């Protein structure tokens, strides 16, 4: 009985890790994208830009 | 201001002055940067340095 409990939680941990890693990946890329959008915003602050640029 | 100048000479001086002023207005209007004019008005500009 005890062994059965342990095995079931092995499986649960397997699937939890699946989802966790899959999130982390796109989350890192989201950080990247936020940062690039930030940089191009800071360039919008450039006080020499013409309207077409 | 020389009282010795004859009026034709004064007219010549006025010609030269007029041409200088023409160049001044040219400089004012026509200078540009990146395509935008700089001095054709009183202007106010903030650069983001932080």
Rounded to an integer, what distance in angstroms lies between the CA atom of residue B43 and that of residue B31? 14
Binary contact (B34, A47; C-beta < 8 A):
no
Binary contact (B34, A52; C-beta < 8 A):
no
Resolution (A): 2.9
Residues β-bridged to residue A26:
none
Binary contact (B34, A50; C-beta < 8 A):
yes
Please report, for residues A9, A19, A29, B12, B33, the alpha-carbon distance to residue A22 in angstroms, rounded to integers and kept in the order given.
20, 5, 12, 84, 49
Helix (H, G, I), strand (E, B) or coil at B46: coil
Pairs of CB atoms within 8 A across A/B: 20
The method of structure determination was cryo-EM
Element (H or E) spanning B32, and its range? strand B32-33
Residue A5 CA, chain-centre distance (Å), reads: 33
Judge whether B41 is closer than 8 Å to chain A, CB to CB: no
Please report, for residues A5, A34, A39, A41, B17, the alpha-carbon distance to residue A31 in angstroms, rounded to integers and kept in the order given.
39, 5, 12, 15, 63
């Amino acid at each position: 009985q005890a062994q059965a409990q342990n095995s079931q939680y092995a499986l649960a941990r397997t699937f939890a890790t699946q989802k966790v890693s899959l999130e982390e990946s796109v989350l890192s890329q989201v950080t990247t994208a936020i940062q690039t959008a930030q940089e191009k915003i800071v360039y919008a602050g450039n006080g020499t830009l013409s309207d077409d640029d | 201001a020389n009282s010795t100048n004859s009026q034709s000479d004064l007219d010549s001086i006025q010609a030269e002055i007029t041409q200088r002023l023409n160049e001044i207005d040219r400089v004012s209007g026509q200078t540009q940067f990146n395509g935008v004019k700089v001095l054709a008005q009183d202007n106010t500009l903030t650069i983001q340095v932080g």
